[PDB]
Design a protein around this ligand. Structure first.
Ligand code: STL
Length: 483
């Protein structure tokens, strides 16, 4: 085999568990990379700034409906709402008027199928954690999607073995064998699409474009101009990027680099520029100052991706049925809450890293409205308020009175990092935030019905530990509210 004993044990374990071969193939290639001693470092000297890109705001031409007839909308749906105190699927959290993330996506897909392209496809990448809840949700609200859920809609995310840090064997945890497996990140989309045969099914059915995005990003909506841009400029992989702010300096950034490819078979050697991403775990320690210079590297990946499916098929077929992405070596314990459990590596890939694998690749600067994830209960509060309205095509946008700027919400760790605390805060009503520039809430607070906030409002409770309610109908303007 030339595989090490550790790699063979991984193969044996995944074989025994009926893991599909395209996943084993890809994972073993990553295992070899790790076992070779791959650092995965990306210094500033191997990379260069992007400098200039096109802008969605500057585009005007829309594609005709025939392109949408050959387009697949795929939403990443494997993540839980753990970061907000939610042990179930993130996309099933209510956002507006009883509608979840999944509602708006399905209603947007429904609007397009009714008014533009009946053959537009909708897919969901689920994990074992989110599958049953999603299927049950669609069965009640969108039967047409439920009828074809198993056959057409759902894409299952793989699970790969966690491996020990010292010997790289498949880790063992008798207390909970499920903790031996872990998802390989959203870069697994390419492996799942190929290995499940769905990528080949989509291409042979005539589908040409796939728009991938995070399920919990309410701004990632179909924009016909992006499809026209790719048809005109002959793009196989387009990444939507936004400009990095000071709060984004810890996140990844787009970059350029130049590669010399030794010619395989009889064809000549090739030199070319490619796009790529660099996150902090890849950046050398000494280059971290440059990593955070938002004026040098000014763009970050939104995970809004547009891919040519026939080109992706050819590329993965050229690499033995895989897509070789840079591996992230996540160091945890096999039970991350048990500090004495065996230390392990969790091998992961990012789906935005595939931009370096396509010859006709490009990035486009989009407004930050297209990158609007709900990562805090503060974000959720603004969205549920009247500061946001629903369009006739089921998009969520600001009301005009906000004049393009959303109300800032800062909420206290105490009480509100989790949904359980936030749910009592809006027990009898959600306050109007359409006119509020900024609301900070310190300590425990509850809202009454019909409340309105305007200007910059602060509400502090100095460790009272008692109730601290706010009456029904009150309106706070440019003030601070204390007991
Ligand atoms: O509808 C719109 C919503 C938001 C915006 C502002 C966008 C913006 C875009 C960037 O690349 C960086 C940034 O800090 C902000 C523009 C239009």
């Amino acid at each position: 085999k030339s595989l090490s004993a550790a790699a063979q044990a991984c193969v044996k374990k995944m074989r025994d568990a009926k893991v599909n071969e395209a996943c084993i193939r890809t994972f073993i290639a990553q295992h070899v990379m790790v076992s070779k001693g791959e650092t995965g470092s990306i210094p500033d000297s191997a990379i260069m700034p992007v400098d200039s890109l096109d802008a969605l705001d500057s585009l005007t031409i829309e594609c005709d409906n025939a392109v949408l007839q050959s387009t697949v909308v795929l939403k990443l749906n494997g993540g839980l709402g753990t970061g907000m105190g939610l042990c179930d699927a993130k996309t099933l959290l209510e956002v507006k008027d009883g509608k979840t993330f999944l509602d708006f996506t399905a209603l947007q897909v429904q609007y397009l199928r009714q008014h533009c392209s009946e053959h537009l496809r909708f897919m969901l990448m689920d994990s074992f954690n989110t599958s049953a809840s999603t299927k049950s949700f669609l069965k009640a609200r969108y039967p047409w999607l439920y009828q074809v859920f198993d056959s057409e809609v759902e894409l299952m995310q793989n699970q790969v073995p966690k491996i020990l840090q010292d010997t790289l064997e498949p880790a063992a945890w008798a207390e909970n064998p499920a903790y031996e497996w872990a998802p390989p990140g959203h870069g697994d989309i390419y492996t799942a699409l190929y290995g499940s045969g769905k990528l080949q099914e989509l291409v042979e059915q005539g589908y040409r474009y796939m728009f991938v995005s995070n399920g919990d990003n309410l701004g990632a909506t179909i924009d016909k101009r992006v499809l026209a841009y790719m048809e005109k400029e002959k793009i196989d992989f387009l990444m939507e990027v936004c400009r990095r702010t000071e709060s984004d300096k810890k996140g990844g950034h787009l970059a350029r680099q130049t590669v010399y490819v030794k010619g395989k078979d009889g064809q000549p050697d090739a030199e070319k520029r490619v796009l790529l991403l660099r996150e902090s775990a890849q950046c050398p320690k000494a280059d971290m100052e440059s990593f955070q210079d938002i004026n040098k590297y000014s763009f970050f990946n939104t995970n809004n991706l547009w891919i040519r499916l026939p080109v992706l098929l050819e590329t993965m077929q050229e690499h033995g049925g895989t897509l070789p992405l840079p591996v992230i070596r996540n160091e945890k314990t096999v039970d991350s809450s048990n500090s004495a459990s065996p230390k392990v590596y969790q091998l992961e890939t990012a789906m935005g890293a595939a931009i370096a694998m396509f010859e006709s690749a490009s990035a486009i600067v989009v407004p930050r409205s297209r990158f609007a994830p709900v990562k805090t209960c503060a974000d959720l509060l603004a969205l549920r308020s009247d500061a946001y309205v629903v369009t006739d095509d089921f998009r969520l946008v600001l009301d005009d009175r906000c004049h393009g700027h959303p109300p800032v919400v800062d909420l206290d760790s105490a009480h509100y990092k989790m949904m359980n605390g936030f749910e009592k805060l809006v027990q009898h009503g959600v306050p109007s935030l359409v006119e509020c520039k900024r609301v900070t809430v310190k300590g425990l607070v509850q809202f009454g019905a019909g409340n309105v906030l305007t200007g910059t409002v602060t509400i502090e409770n100095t460790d009272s530990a008692s109730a601290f309610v706010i009456p029904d109908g009150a309106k706070l303007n440019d003030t601070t509210a204390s007991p």
